[model samples]
Target: SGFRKMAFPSGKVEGCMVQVTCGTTTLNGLWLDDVVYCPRHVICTSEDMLNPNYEDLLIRKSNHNFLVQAGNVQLRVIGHSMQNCVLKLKVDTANPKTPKYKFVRIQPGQTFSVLACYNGSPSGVYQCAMRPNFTIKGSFLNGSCGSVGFNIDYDCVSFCYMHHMELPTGVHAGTDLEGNFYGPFVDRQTAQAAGTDTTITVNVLAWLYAAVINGDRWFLNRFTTTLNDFNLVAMKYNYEPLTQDHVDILGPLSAQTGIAVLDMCASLKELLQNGMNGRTILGSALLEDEFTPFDVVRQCSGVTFQ
Candidate 1:
């Protein structure tokens, strides 16, 4: 039940026609959704369009799904009377998991929809001739994983905190050589003594963590400017989107620095990939989904929560 036909291209739809010589019965009309070339582009003579033979074309069912074959580049569809068209195609020999696609209400006949099927990751030159009467009109590009299109790696640094320390070459959760849980440290003692409720040290540290990894200069600039405005305590634990009110425990952090360790959890892929040591900055970061009542698992070569 979770199956769809393969057409040309991956993200969007394309238009095409068929040639007279190609057998009309070879294609069916209900399969109209699999069309790739316009009839005007088909070349005559089995030697012209049928030599290399095009039975593979790329395909994408929805915005997020794509399929391909191993070496085929042709997906020829033969049409009869322009009423019933049949599609010839191939499936991608790679990737075993089914892609999750967003379901949208489709109005039949309102628009032509096609999903591209690929056999392999392009390696060598591939050749195929469209029938003389049919031609390809257009295709599409899939957007990246961010909101404003494409992905943004937030890697930038505004200032240096603990350079001389033998901070390992990766990310982990642990304390320093002194046995202090290396969580972002805010001199809460200093803030309470001065009667000023903000902890600036921790805020600087967290921002530093994000900046160091992403190397995003823009984020560093905004972080510095924002740091200058808010007290350290406010910066140590804050999320701008999820948290709006002042001093809320689970407040939101700016896009430059979203969920602290949680971002680490999702982005790093593997647990051993994140580790930390020595004195570090702990910018505006709140522990919500990240904070656990029950100890689960700690990952890192030189880091631990306790």
Candidate 2:
């Protein structure tokens, strides 16, 4: 019960100090209703709820890890001092598995470090609460005052690549940081022909996919300003943070666009067919940990390779 109990006797009310009587039915002095009268101490009668409250017991984090992906949240209990407290967590309640949290006995100064994910699409709420069933807290109240059953509402707005602008038509070309005349090709076929000597790093193909269909704008922007990264493939070497470690494969795609059909894979196949080494913009040392562009192409492009 989230209630404050106060008992005023058949008496006259003053200001802060009033005739609010306690167990000792005697007017020792003008009783301060607002202030609890100890002999010389201000006995605090206004207490926090007897049980662990919903938010009070738990810590909330957003997009914490692989489990709590983007557009999702994670919740865990932290520092529950109440000896008899138990957390009631129900996530994605109707989710077929109905993930139910066991009685989390969060002892004093101890934390529940385990993370969990929930709250999916189509607008549904995850309900949870915290309470102590046993007689606990100060002697005044053995019965535990329950907590607010706070709810986690659905709030996931994922990103989708919309066709903001069409491809710049005509033979598109640019002078890169390497003083190399890289493009101005009417199509990717001509672009591949220009790079027959060296293995052209494949971002141009991803950019073409965006223009021809639409790739993740994030991918394009992440690389566009990274002139140092631009030097990685040119052998114009210098140390820069490895930026292309991950690309959101289909993450940026607008479902309605032709890109949904893996049209970009065709260009990847063409690049490999044109005798271009399908090397990554990332370094060889990085690939020692990461696998290979050849492997990446087969999975992402959905094309087979020996």
Candidate 3:
């Protein structure tokens, strides 16, 4: 028999079998020395990507892993740098009917890999089926972690206009007019719908935040940082981070005065720092805010977020 069957065990809510990323030294420690020993559904032995021309990247018609030959598989992986960068794999069985992938936090530029076997039916089409398992290209990085990556959603302290600001906005003034609170928006349902742990890239929002402040152009304090993070690309690039800082300092005197303004000022600071991370070529800070989310189009000085 050419097949070897093993009673593979799955991980629990807080526990799993996949190695945790320990530290920089531990990251590349584990290598694929023997393919036979390395778990099948855990590692992609080859780097070849399925042909999009003939393959549709299909999900299993049935709600389970359909055993297929290793020769029939290829990969389509997604990657993102993390703040803490601890690579761990999580399986969301909550919706077993529609299972989800939750990632263990990984460091910036660290690679996250998932294994999927291709379907053999229908001849030429190479549809994807079953998210059998995953493995990150780093070792066990452990210890408490926080936004190693930008969290535009968590930054949304409540509803629209409300921010991660310690003091926040809206209610800070004489009257709480616009509704305020944090938002991952809609619900975690939407989050799960998009597939757990898929790294979201908001280089544009980060840039818009930067151009406004670094250029010393517009006023972001007028609205919520949450709105900017959620719809930074949509809001355009005209907003000024620096001018917003100035506006907060000299704007109307009200409860939204001290910390509310300061927190926003601080959030801008985070965006600026993000621009300089190792993999970046150039970074920026904003001096002003824009009129609309689309203002970013004008804010760009001829460079795309790439």
Candidate 4:
């Protein structure tokens, strides 16, 4: 895994759900397919990633979604305007069973990356578990230090994977007495162990390939919906609408399925936008209609009404 940028949350809304983001709206190679949310487990390579480019593949990063790898394990770049913007050099995982680590330090620009590994009851990190994660705030962001926030950019494959994981044959479950069989199947079993949803976040909306199930009672109606509906802090300051490389098409009946069907704020907006018919929600009739959220939209950037 590549060493990525890191950020400590500031407020109560800090991590939202203690998530390690790959970028503003992207994640490390996580979502593999419709039924499988796979992860890419890589060694913390000293060769600061150059980010692979597959000419044949029409690689595109989804909104608030991770990437989907082909075969083997690769750390490819998937951001829409992504590729090349990271500090490099860092690694670790601290094999606690026979616990080991690669000691390193940070001197500002000296170390472009970071060494971030997690352990349940250990002191240091397992070398394989150690992946770097740290980077300076990008230039595009003009907000002050206090008002800004970030999307995590680190190798959380181990942390996320280990949430409900088990060790392999070669890899020892405990320290010392444990042997070697880690690396190879570690990432996969980790992914298989941790499916589409994690225990941390309550994903009321399962926005994937072809699955649509509405969960509307009365809440999320007046309030905002959809993940990252607005920029964490930037919009409040700049009022610039959020970006929209995403689109919602095909819903109502069999047409509605997966992520493409759900409208973050439109369920109720349907009532607001209608003069023809007084739209009906879960069981309530439409009331007043008018909702404006942070940010000005050039892209589905406006607020939703109820």
Candidate 5:
């Protein structure tokens, strides 16, 4: 009987050791593997061999990598040996001689935080790829790198109006008449609840300053008309108009903030105004400034409408 138990010296075997039987004898040893190796027992070696080849290619539309915001687009790169990558925005590929491309360099692990003017391809679609360092045939790209694509079909009218109105990115103009400074608000109700008439007055004037700076006549005209309307209502109710002292306070604020609020309101006498409540004719006062309505009912109980 040929029977012997042998033990090898301590060393690492890099591959699987499957047992083999020859007649009544058995042996175990390392198994040769392919480019993709299975590191766990749960995975089948045959299935791994038959699996489709995959690569960690560039991801363009991921929220972590790309972002689209008002008036601009932003993107960033992570990993993938991206150091010294050449970045370009292909605006119109159809017009090759028109010089419609912009080029910049991104570092290995990151790209710039912002890109402006909605840069993209001829089809109004946008993508970012590593130039001269990567190649693609639609389905496959080389070296774990590929193009990242996204789309932007922004509505011009809405975008313009928001920009002119100084929304989302409006400048801060300090505290209100009651010396109460509130954070950013989305609507008039929230602003009124948080502050009072003074908050609305400052924010409206602040938007006017933005309109002038941006040279947006539409915004100027719309706000001016609304302000004038509120004044008319206030005058009819005999509420005291915005006085010279009020303008004086705004003047220093404009000077300090470079918002030009006083300059816009210089000609307009009154800021806040009041009128009848739409709900009932019980002398309900619709108390409001140009931008927001103050909760005058709660503040002034003597003049109740409902």
Candidate 6:
């Protein structure tokens, strides 16, 4: 039974309390009618939520192993073994059957890092392995170099790149089409509210693509400036972020005009959707990751390696 006993009572409301009176009975206390209450749930209802820096909510994570911080602007793969073998940084080599390597040589105990702007699949395994020497003894290599590899989650890589890159102040101070001053700061807040990096990245790219096609200098300048500011923020937060991709995308916009940019944008969307086309666009490196440079025109804008 979902039924409970109830009694009718006359009620009187005071400033901050309510009084209920029944036959020979009276009750006075803070009640729903008189007590102040939340209209709805506040996002910051808990103390933890109130924390200004809630782990990439307000600010991006500053201390990720692969993520490059200020000054360096490069992705470093460290080699710290006793062996003096050469190290290589291979991207998108998850499939053992068809292996490919983006080799970057590092000497013994050396650190090999690349600029974050280096284009590839945002979500893929970028492995760092010690190149093994061939041995005449057996099918296996001469010896084990003791290599380590890590995977880059799409959300993490994309956000890391976007959040760390420096942006210009003009982007933040400028207003949107609606005359609102919500820029990168607001973008981060809205992104946190949404609680996903893909959504935020898509939203940001949508703005960029639209602005570029429309030839809206105000919006374009704002976007570029905001990106510059993000790069600076990355540096401030000890992230050596890069933005060559932004320049590449923006450069073509100025050179070819809106029609060309839009045409490329359309082509990119199609290319990314088709796996074969993505592979073709990205060369022999197959499209294992959906969030490849094809997904974002900016990612492959001026980078020939991709």
**What C-alpha lDDT, on a 0 to 100 scale, does residue 59 get in candidate 5?**
28
What is the C-alpha lDDT profile of model 4 across 51-140, one tens digit per residue? 333221213434234332222332233333221121111112211122111112221111111112211011111112211111222221
Output the worst ten-in-a-row residue range by lDDT, candidate 5: 156-165
lDDT of each: 0.21, 0.21, 0.21, 0.22, 0.23, 0.23
Q: Find the 10 residues in a row with the least total lDDT in model 1.
A: 143-152
> Considering summed lDDT, which 10 consecutive residues are worst modelled in model 2?
157-166
lDDT of 2 by residue, 45-153 (tens): 2231222232442233121211211123322222111121211122221222111112222211111110011111111112111111111111111111111111111
Ranking by TM-score: 6, 5, 4, 3, 1, 2
Models, CA RMSD each: 24.0, 27.7, 21.2, 21.9, 28.3, 28.0
TM-score of 4: 0.18
Query: For residues 1-306, what per-residue lDDT tens digits would candidate 1 score against the true structure?
Result: 111111212221111111112321111111123322122112223343323222221111221121211123333323211111112222222222222222222111111122221111211111111111111111212110000000001221111011011112212121111223223322121111111122222222333333443442222221221323333223333322112222232123333245443332222122112323232222322221221111111111112211
Whole-model lDDT, candidate 4? 0.22
Count of clashing pairs, candidate 5: 3
State the lDDT of candidate 3 residue by residue for 155-199, as single tens digits: 121101101111111111000002111222221111112112222
